């Protein structure tokens, strides 16, 4: 049982996971596997990892009290990407493209 406003957030999450954004959303479909990739400083630099699979599990588990809590996790996910990766990296460009989608949708949903 999600509130009307969190239902709009769930719709945004579904859009971010949809096929049309797959070319730039895929880095965010699961946590960064720093051990498998041997990025040995990832967790020293990124104190609070976040990704869309975790956001979805929290949404489905009714863990977000309001839209701002959902948006905080989405923005944390993007901020981690900007913090960890080189500024000209392909994955930073993908983050910006997906964040543009998110910020437009989040801005435009009904109020309250």
């Amino acid at each position: 049982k999600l509130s009307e406003h969190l239902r709009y957030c769930d719709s945004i999450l579904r859009e971010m996971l949809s096929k049309k954004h797959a070319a730039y959303a895929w880095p965010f479909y699961k946590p960064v596997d720093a051990e498998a990739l041997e990025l040995h400083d990832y967790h020293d630099i990124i104190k609070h990892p976040m990704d869309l699979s975790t956001v979805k599990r929290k949404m489905d588990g009714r863990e977000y009290p309001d839209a701002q809590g959902f948006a905080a996790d989405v923005r944390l996910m993007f901020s981690n990407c900007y913090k960890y990766n080189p500024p000209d990296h392909e994955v930073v460009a993908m983050a910006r493209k997906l964040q543009d989608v998110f910020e437009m949708r989040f801005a435009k949903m009904p109020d309250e």
């Binding site: 880095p27 498998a36 990739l37 990296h89 994955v91």
Partner: peptide
Amino acid sequence: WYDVFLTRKYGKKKVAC
């Protein structure tokens, strides 16, 4: 997805797809 070999090699994310 990431190229595991090259990501480990260079210490930064390397895109395979």
